[PDB]
Amino acid sequence: SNKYVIIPAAGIGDIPKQYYKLNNGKTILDNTLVKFIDNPLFDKIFVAIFWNNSLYYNHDKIVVCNGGETRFNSVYNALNVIDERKNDDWVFVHDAARPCVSIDSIIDLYEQTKSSHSQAGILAVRAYETVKQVTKNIVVKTLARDNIWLAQTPQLSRLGQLEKAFDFCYSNNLVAKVTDEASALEMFGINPIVVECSKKNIKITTKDDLEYANWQL
Protein backbone atom coordinates (compact mmCIF):
# COMPACT_ATOMS: atom_id res chain seq x y z
CA SER A 1 0.00 0.00 0.00
CA ASN A 2 0.95 3.66 -0.12
CA LYS A 3 2.32 5.69 2.78
CA TYR A 4 1.02 9.23 3.22
CA VAL A 5 2.10 11.89 5.67
CA ILE A 6 -0.21 14.67 6.72
CA ILE A 7 1.43 17.66 8.26
CA PRO A 8 -1.13 20.10 9.71
CA ALA A 9 -0.87 23.79 10.29
CA ALA A 10 -1.94 24.76 13.80
CA GLY A 11 -2.68 27.94 15.74
CA ILE A 12 -5.47 26.61 17.95
CA GLY A 13 -6.67 27.72 20.24
CA ASP A 14 -0.08 36.72 9.60
CA ILE A 15 3.19 34.72 9.53
CA PRO A 16 2.77 31.20 11.00
CA LYS A 17 5.44 29.98 13.48
CA GLN A 18 6.21 27.34 10.84
CA TYR A 19 8.11 29.80 8.65
CA TYR A 20 10.78 30.15 11.34
CA LYS A 21 14.37 29.64 10.10
CA LEU A 22 15.83 28.03 13.19
CA ASN A 23 19.40 26.92 12.75
CA ASN A 24 21.27 26.72 9.44
CA GLY A 25 18.70 29.09 7.95
CA LYS A 26 16.46 26.09 8.06
CA THR A 27 12.75 26.79 8.49
CA ILE A 28 11.11 24.88 11.35
CA LEU A 29 8.58 23.35 8.94
CA ASP A 30 11.22 22.58 6.31
CA ASN A 31 13.48 20.75 8.77
CA THR A 32 10.55 18.51 9.59
CA LEU A 33 9.57 17.95 5.98
CA VAL A 34 13.16 16.73 5.51
CA LYS A 35 12.82 13.44 7.38
CA PHE A 36 9.85 12.45 5.22
CA ILE A 37 10.99 14.02 1.94
CA ASP A 38 14.30 12.14 1.93
CA ASN A 39 12.66 8.87 2.91
CA PRO A 40 11.44 6.36 0.26
CA LEU A 41 9.04 4.84 2.83
CA PHE A 42 6.76 7.84 2.38
CA ASP A 43 5.02 8.23 -0.97
CA LYS A 44 3.36 11.62 -0.57
CA ILE A 45 3.33 14.34 2.05
CA PHE A 46 0.30 16.57 2.48
CA VAL A 47 1.15 19.97 3.93
CA ALA A 48 -2.01 21.84 4.91
CA ILE A 49 -2.26 25.60 5.59
CA PHE A 50 0.42 31.79 0.06
CA TRP A 51 2.75 28.77 -0.20
CA ASN A 52 4.45 29.74 -3.48
CA ASN A 53 6.84 31.77 -1.39
CA SER A 54 7.12 29.69 1.67
CA LEU A 55 9.21 28.71 -0.24
CA TYR A 56 11.55 25.74 -0.08
CA TYR A 57 9.10 23.15 -1.42
CA ASN A 58 7.18 22.84 -4.67
CA HIS A 59 8.67 19.38 -4.49
CA ASP A 60 7.51 16.16 -6.19
CA LYS A 61 6.40 14.38 -2.99
CA ILE A 62 4.77 17.52 -1.62
CA VAL A 63 1.07 18.26 -2.01
CA VAL A 64 -0.33 21.40 -0.43
CA CYS A 65 -3.91 21.65 0.78
CA ASN A 66 -6.28 23.88 2.72
CA GLY A 67 -5.87 23.91 6.48
CA GLY A 68 -8.96 24.42 8.62
CA GLU A 69 -10.31 26.04 11.77
CA THR A 70 -8.64 23.30 13.81
CA ARG A 71 -6.02 20.58 13.60
CA PHE A 72 -8.80 18.03 13.14
CA ASN A 73 -10.13 19.99 10.18
CA SER A 74 -6.76 20.42 8.54
CA VAL A 75 -6.20 16.66 8.75
CA TYR A 76 -9.77 15.92 7.59
CA ASN A 77 -9.21 18.17 4.60
CA ALA A 78 -5.90 16.53 3.80
CA LEU A 79 -7.54 13.07 3.92
CA ASN A 80 -10.27 14.31 1.59
CA VAL A 81 -7.58 15.47 -0.84
CA ILE A 82 -5.83 12.11 -1.19
CA ASP A 83 -7.02 10.96 -4.62
CA GLU A 84 -6.68 7.25 -5.46
CA ARG A 85 -6.69 6.58 -1.72
CA LYS A 86 -7.35 3.02 -0.59
CA ASN A 87 -8.67 1.62 2.71
CA ASP A 88 -5.36 -0.22 3.28
CA ASP A 89 -3.09 2.80 2.68
CA TRP A 90 -1.24 4.28 5.66
CA VAL A 91 -1.45 7.75 7.13
CA PHE A 92 1.18 9.25 9.44
CA VAL A 93 -0.07 12.52 10.89
CA HIS A 94 2.89 14.50 12.14
CA ASP A 95 3.56 17.80 13.93
CA ALA A 96 4.88 20.53 11.63
CA ALA A 97 7.30 21.34 14.50
CA ARG A 98 8.89 18.02 15.38
CA PRO A 99 11.94 17.76 13.20
CA CYS A 100 13.57 15.78 16.05
CA VAL A 101 11.71 12.49 15.59
CA SER A 102 14.14 9.62 14.93
CA ILE A 103 14.00 7.23 12.01
CA ASP A 104 14.22 4.21 14.36
CA SER A 105 11.05 5.39 16.07
CA ILE A 106 9.15 5.90 12.88
CA ILE A 107 10.20 2.42 11.70
CA ASP A 108 9.26 0.84 15.04
CA LEU A 109 5.88 2.53 14.83
CA TYR A 110 5.15 1.42 11.29
CA GLU A 111 6.15 -2.22 11.87
CA GLN A 112 4.48 -2.74 15.19
CA THR A 113 1.34 -0.98 13.96
CA LYS A 114 1.29 -3.12 10.83
CA SER A 115 1.22 -6.31 12.85
CA SER A 116 -1.33 -5.09 15.41
CA HIS A 117 -5.01 -5.89 15.74
CA SER A 118 -5.83 -2.13 15.76
CA GLN A 119 -3.83 -1.16 12.70
CA ALA A 120 -3.30 2.16 14.52
CA GLY A 121 -0.41 3.32 16.66
CA ILE A 122 1.13 6.43 18.16
CA LEU A 123 4.62 7.28 19.34
CA ALA A 124 4.52 8.12 23.05
CA VAL A 125 6.66 8.79 26.11
CA ARG A 126 5.83 7.46 29.55
CA ALA A 127 4.70 9.91 32.23
CA TYR A 128 6.53 9.60 35.54
CA GLU A 129 5.54 13.04 36.70
CA THR A 130 2.02 13.29 38.18
CA VAL A 131 -0.62 14.60 35.81
CA LYS A 132 -2.64 17.42 37.29
CA GLN A 133 -5.54 19.45 36.07
CA VAL A 134 -5.74 23.10 36.88
CA THR A 135 -8.24 25.95 36.94
CA LYS A 136 -6.98 29.51 37.39
CA ASN A 137 -3.46 28.37 38.36
CA ILE A 138 -5.03 26.11 41.02
CA VAL A 139 -4.77 22.32 41.03
CA VAL A 140 -8.30 20.97 40.69
CA LYS A 141 -7.64 17.25 40.07
CA THR A 142 -4.82 14.67 40.11
CA LEU A 143 -4.17 11.33 38.30
CA ALA A 144 -3.37 8.08 40.09
CA ARG A 145 -0.30 6.31 38.70
CA ASP A 146 0.96 4.81 36.54
CA ASN A 147 -0.34 3.83 33.10
CA ILE A 148 0.11 7.37 31.78
CA TRP A 149 1.82 8.47 28.52
CA LEU A 150 2.15 11.77 26.67
CA ALA A 151 1.28 11.18 23.01
CA GLN A 152 3.85 12.13 20.39
CA THR A 153 3.61 12.20 16.63
CA PRO A 154 3.75 10.54 14.13
CA GLN A 155 0.41 8.95 14.77
CA LEU A 156 -0.30 6.21 12.32
CA SER A 157 -3.40 4.45 11.01
CA ARG A 158 -4.74 2.55 8.03
CA LEU A 159 -6.42 5.16 5.86
CA GLY A 160 -9.90 3.70 5.53
CA GLN A 161 -10.51 3.37 9.23
CA LEU A 162 -9.03 6.81 9.82
CA GLU A 163 -11.48 8.43 7.41
CA LYS A 164 -14.35 6.55 9.00
CA ALA A 165 -13.31 7.77 12.48
CA PHE A 166 -13.00 11.32 11.20
CA ASP A 167 -16.40 11.16 9.49
CA PHE A 168 -17.84 9.73 12.68
CA CYS A 169 -16.36 12.53 14.84
CA TYR A 170 -17.31 15.27 12.44
CA SER A 171 -20.85 14.07 11.86
CA ASN A 172 -21.37 13.64 15.65
CA ASN A 173 -19.90 17.02 16.58
CA LEU A 174 -17.01 15.48 18.59
CA VAL A 175 -14.43 17.68 16.92
CA ALA A 176 -13.76 19.91 19.92
CA LYS A 177 -13.19 16.80 22.03
CA VAL A 178 -10.63 15.63 19.47
CA THR A 179 -7.02 16.31 20.34
CA ASP A 180 -4.79 13.90 18.44
CA GLU A 181 -5.46 11.34 15.72
CA ALA A 182 -5.63 8.59 18.32
CA SER A 183 -8.45 10.31 20.20
CA ALA A 184 -10.55 10.42 17.03
CA LEU A 185 -9.91 6.70 16.60
CA GLU A 186 -10.71 5.91 20.27
CA MET A 187 -14.04 7.73 20.04
CA PHE A 188 -14.69 5.60 16.96
CA GLY A 189 -13.95 2.52 19.00
CA ILE A 190 -10.41 1.92 17.76
CA ASN A 191 -7.63 1.81 20.35
CA PRO A 192 -4.13 2.40 18.89
CA ILE A 193 -1.03 0.64 20.14
CA VAL A 194 1.69 2.69 21.85
CA VAL A 195 5.26 2.71 20.72
CA GLU A 196 7.85 4.21 23.00
CA CYS A 197 9.87 6.94 21.34
CA SER A 198 12.58 9.00 23.01
CA LYS A 199 12.04 12.02 25.22
CA LYS A 200 14.35 13.56 22.60
CA ASN A 201 11.29 13.72 20.30
CA ILE A 202 9.72 17.02 21.33
CA LYS A 203 7.49 19.67 19.74
CA ILE A 204 8.96 23.12 19.31
CA THR A 205 6.68 25.36 21.39
CA THR A 206 9.18 27.39 23.44
CA LYS A 207 12.55 29.06 23.11
CA ASP A 208 13.82 26.43 25.59
CA ASP A 209 13.08 23.33 23.49
CA LEU A 210 14.37 25.41 20.58
CA GLU A 211 17.67 25.43 22.46
CA TYR A 212 17.25 21.67 23.04
CA ALA A 213 16.68 21.36 19.32
CA ASN A 214 19.93 23.12 18.47
CA TRP A 215 22.05 21.13 20.95
CA GLN A 216 20.18 18.16 19.43
CA LEU A 217 21.78 19.30 16.13
Added chain:
Amino acid sequence: SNKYVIIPAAGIGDIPKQYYKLNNGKTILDNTLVKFIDNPLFDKIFVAIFWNNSLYYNHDKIVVCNGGETRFNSVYNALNVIDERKNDDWVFVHDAARPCVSIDSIIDLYEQTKSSHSQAGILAVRAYETVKQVTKNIVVKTLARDNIWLAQTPQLSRLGQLEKAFDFCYSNNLVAKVTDEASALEMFGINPIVVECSKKNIKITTKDDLEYANWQL
Protein backbone atom coordinates in the same frame (compact mmCIF):
# COMPACT_ATOMS: atom_id res chain seq x y z
CA SER B 1 9.46 30.68 59.89
CA ASN B 2 11.99 28.03 58.94
CA LYS B 3 12.43 26.53 55.49
CA TYR B 4 13.04 22.79 55.26
CA VAL B 5 13.83 20.68 52.24
CA ILE B 6 13.05 16.99 52.13
CA ILE B 7 14.86 15.00 49.54
CA PRO B 8 13.53 11.43 49.28
CA ALA B 9 15.23 8.31 48.10
CA ALA B 10 13.13 6.42 45.56
CA GLY B 11 13.17 3.04 43.84
CA ILE B 12 9.43 2.47 43.63
CA GLY B 13 7.94 0.58 42.17
CA ASP B 14 22.51 -2.26 46.31
CA ILE B 15 23.84 1.06 44.98
CA PRO B 16 21.04 3.65 44.49
CA LYS B 17 21.01 5.64 41.19
CA GLN B 18 21.63 8.68 43.41
CA TYR B 19 25.30 7.84 43.89
CA TYR B 20 25.94 8.45 40.19
CA LYS B 21 28.83 10.84 39.44
CA LEU B 22 27.44 12.48 36.33
CA ASN B 23 29.61 15.25 35.01
CA ASN B 24 32.54 16.85 36.84
CA GLY B 25 32.69 13.78 39.07
CA LYS B 26 29.60 15.22 40.60
CA THR B 27 27.13 12.73 42.07
CA ILE B 28 23.56 13.13 40.80
CA LEU B 29 22.30 13.55 44.37
CA ASP B 30 25.13 15.92 45.34
CA ASN B 31 24.51 18.23 42.36
CA THR B 32 20.94 18.58 43.54
CA LEU B 33 21.86 19.12 47.17
CA VAL B 34 24.01 22.00 45.88
CA LYS B 35 21.18 24.37 44.98
CA PHE B 36 19.74 24.08 48.50
CA ILE B 37 23.01 23.79 50.42
CA ASP B 38 24.40 27.03 48.99
CA ASN B 39 21.14 28.88 49.52
CA PRO B 40 20.43 30.83 52.76
CA LEU B 41 16.67 30.56 52.07
CA PHE B 42 16.80 26.94 53.19
CA ASP B 43 17.52 26.25 56.85
CA LYS B 44 17.82 22.47 56.86
CA ILE B 45 17.78 19.73 54.26
CA PHE B 46 16.54 16.26 55.14
CA VAL B 47 18.06 13.54 52.97
CA ALA B 48 16.27 10.23 53.50
CA ILE B 49 17.59 6.79 52.50
CA PHE B 50 25.39 3.64 54.81
CA TRP B 51 25.66 7.42 54.27
CA ASN B 52 29.04 7.92 56.00
CA ASN B 53 30.62 7.04 52.69
CA SER B 54 28.19 8.51 50.29
CA LEU B 55 30.16 10.66 50.96
CA TYR B 56 30.24 14.34 50.06
CA TYR B 57 27.95 15.55 52.85
CA ASN B 58 28.15 15.36 56.62
CA HIS B 59 27.39 19.04 56.22
CA ASP B 60 25.88 21.47 58.74
CA LYS B 61 22.56 21.97 56.90
CA ILE B 62 22.27 18.27 56.12
CA VAL B 63 20.25 15.87 58.26
CA VAL B 64 20.01 12.25 57.19
CA CYS B 65 17.00 10.08 57.99
CA ASN B 66 15.44 6.72 57.26
CA GLY B 67 13.78 6.32 53.88
CA GLY B 68 10.76 4.04 53.62
CA GLU B 69 8.98 1.50 51.43
CA THR B 70 7.73 4.37 49.26
CA ARG B 71 8.33 8.02 48.49
CA PHE B 72 5.37 8.90 50.70
CA ASN B 73 6.95 7.02 53.59
CA SER B 74 10.37 8.56 53.14
CA VAL B 75 8.80 12.02 53.25
CA TYR B 76 6.54 11.07 56.19
CA ASN B 77 9.60 9.87 58.07
CA ALA B 78 11.52 13.03 57.26
CA LEU B 79 8.60 15.18 58.54
CA ASN B 80 8.52 13.11 61.74
CA VAL B 81 12.24 13.82 62.20
CA ILE B 82 11.99 17.62 62.09
CA ASP B 83 12.37 18.53 65.77
CA GLU B 84 11.22 22.00 66.86
CA ARG B 85 8.93 22.00 63.82
CA LYS B 86 6.12 24.56 63.76
CA ASN B 87 2.80 24.61 61.88
CA ASP B 88 3.91 27.73 59.96
CA ASP B 89 7.29 26.35 58.83
CA TRP B 90 7.76 25.54 55.13
CA VAL B 91 8.55 22.24 53.48
CA PHE B 92 9.92 21.91 49.95
CA VAL B 93 9.91 18.27 48.88
CA HIS B 94 12.30 17.85 45.99
CA ASP B 95 13.47 15.08 43.64
CA ALA B 96 16.93 13.73 44.47
CA ALA B 97 17.52 13.80 40.68
CA ARG B 98 16.53 17.30 39.62
CA PRO B 99 19.66 19.36 39.89
CA CYS B 100 18.34 21.42 36.95
CA VAL B 101 15.66 23.39 38.80
CA SER B 102 16.28 27.15 38.53
CA ILE B 103 16.52 29.57 41.42
CA ASP B 104 13.97 31.92 39.78
CA SER B 105 11.45 29.08 39.82
CA ILE B 106 12.04 28.19 43.41
CA ILE B 107 11.67 31.87 44.39
CA ASP B 108 8.50 32.25 42.31
CA LEU B 109 7.09 29.17 43.99
CA TYR B 110 7.87 30.30 47.51
CA GLU B 111 6.47 33.82 47.05
CA GLN B 112 3.32 32.94 45.21
CA THR B 113 2.64 30.07 47.61
CA LYS B 114 3.18 32.35 50.59
CA SER B 115 0.51 34.74 49.42
CA SER B 116 -2.00 32.05 48.41
CA HIS B 117 -5.13 30.87 50.16
CA SER B 118 -3.86 27.25 50.01
CA GLN B 119 -0.40 27.87 51.39
CA ALA B 120 0.66 25.00 49.08
CA GLY B 121 2.14 25.11 45.60
CA ILE B 122 3.96 22.98 43.07
CA LEU B 123 6.20 23.80 40.13
CA ALA B 124 4.61 22.47 36.94
CA VAL B 125 4.84 22.49 33.15
CA ARG B 126 1.81 22.69 30.90
CA ALA B 127 0.84 19.63 28.86
CA TYR B 128 0.24 20.30 25.17
CA GLU B 129 0.64 16.69 24.19
CA THR B 130 -2.45 14.52 24.75
CA VAL B 131 -2.41 12.45 27.91
CA LYS B 132 -3.21 8.82 27.30
CA GLN B 133 -3.59 5.83 29.52
CA VAL B 134 -2.35 2.48 28.40
CA THR B 135 -2.72 -1.20 29.22
CA LYS B 136 -0.32 -3.69 27.64
CA ASN B 137 1.07 -1.13 25.17
CA ILE B 138 -2.53 -0.37 24.09
CA VAL B 139 -4.23 3.00 24.52
CA VAL B 140 -7.17 2.47 26.85
CA LYS B 141 -8.22 6.07 27.59
CA THR B 142 -7.55 9.66 26.47
CA LEU B 143 -7.80 13.12 28.16
CA ALA B 144 -9.78 16.03 26.74
CA ARG B 145 -7.79 19.27 26.57
CA ASP B 146 -6.52 21.51 27.96
CA ASN B 147 -6.12 22.22 31.67
CA ILE B 148 -3.38 19.61 32.01
CA TRP B 149 0.06 20.01 33.69
CA LEU B 150 2.87 17.62 34.58
CA ALA B 151 3.88 18.26 38.20
CA GLN B 152 7.51 19.10 38.92
CA THR B 153 9.33 19.49 42.19
CA PRO B 154 9.91 21.36 44.47
CA GLN B 155 6.46 20.98 45.91
CA LEU B 156 5.90 23.35 48.75
CA SER B 157 3.55 23.53 51.74
CA ARG B 158 3.23 24.94 55.22
CA LEU B 159 4.48 22.21 57.53
CA GLY B 160 1.51 21.79 59.84
CA GLN B 161 -1.01 21.21 57.10
CA LEU B 162 1.41 18.91 55.31
CA GLU B 163 1.75 16.68 58.37
CA LYS B 164 -2.01 16.63 58.80
CA ALA B 165 -2.49 15.58 55.15
CA PHE B 166 0.14 12.88 55.54
CA ASP B 167 -1.41 11.60 58.76
CA PHE B 168 -4.78 11.63 57.05
CA CYS B 169 -3.49 9.63 54.04
CA TYR B 170 -1.56 7.18 56.14
CA SER B 171 -4.32 6.55 58.65
CA ASN B 172 -6.86 6.09 55.80
CA ASN B 173 -4.66 3.78 53.74
CA LEU B 174 -4.45 6.21 50.78
CA VAL B 175 -0.69 5.86 50.51
CA ALA B 176 -0.68 3.82 47.30
CA LYS B 177 -2.93 6.45 45.70
CA VAL B 178 -0.39 9.10 46.70
CA THR B 179 2.02 10.16 43.98
CA ASP B 180 3.37 13.62 44.79
CA GLU B 181 3.06 15.89 47.80
CA ALA B 182 0.23 17.77 46.13
CA SER B 183 -1.86 14.63 45.76
CA ALA B 184 -1.62 13.98 49.50
CA LEU B 185 -2.79 17.54 50.09
CA GLU B 186 -5.65 17.27 47.54
CA MET B 187 -6.95 14.10 49.18
CA PHE B 188 -6.85 16.07 52.44
CA GLY B 189 -8.92 18.77 50.80
CA ILE B 190 -6.10 21.21 50.09
CA ASN B 191 -5.56 22.29 46.48
CA PRO B 192 -2.07 23.73 45.80
CA ILE B 193 -1.43 26.57 43.40
CA VAL B 194 0.58 25.90 40.24
CA VAL B 195 3.67 27.82 39.33
CA GLU B 196 5.03 27.47 35.84
CA CYS B 197 8.65 26.37 35.77
CA SER B 198 10.69 25.70 32.65
CA LYS B 199 10.65 22.50 30.61
CA LYS B 200 14.39 22.72 31.38
CA ASN B 201 13.52 21.43 34.87
CA ILE B 202 13.52 17.67 34.34
CA LYS B 203 14.11 14.53 36.43
CA ILE B 204 17.05 12.37 35.50
CA THR B 205 15.48 9.01 34.60
CA THR B 206 17.15 8.20 31.27
CA LYS B 207 20.50 8.47 29.55
CA ASP B 208 18.80 10.98 27.20
CA ASP B 209 17.85 13.59 29.82
CA LEU B 210 21.29 12.88 31.27
CA GLU B 211 22.62 14.21 27.97
CA TYR B 212 20.17 17.14 28.27
CA ALA B 213 21.56 17.68 31.74
CA ASN B 214 25.13 17.91 30.50
CA TRP B 215 24.34 20.28 27.61
CA GLN B 216 22.36 22.13 30.31
CA LEU B 217 25.76 22.44 32.08
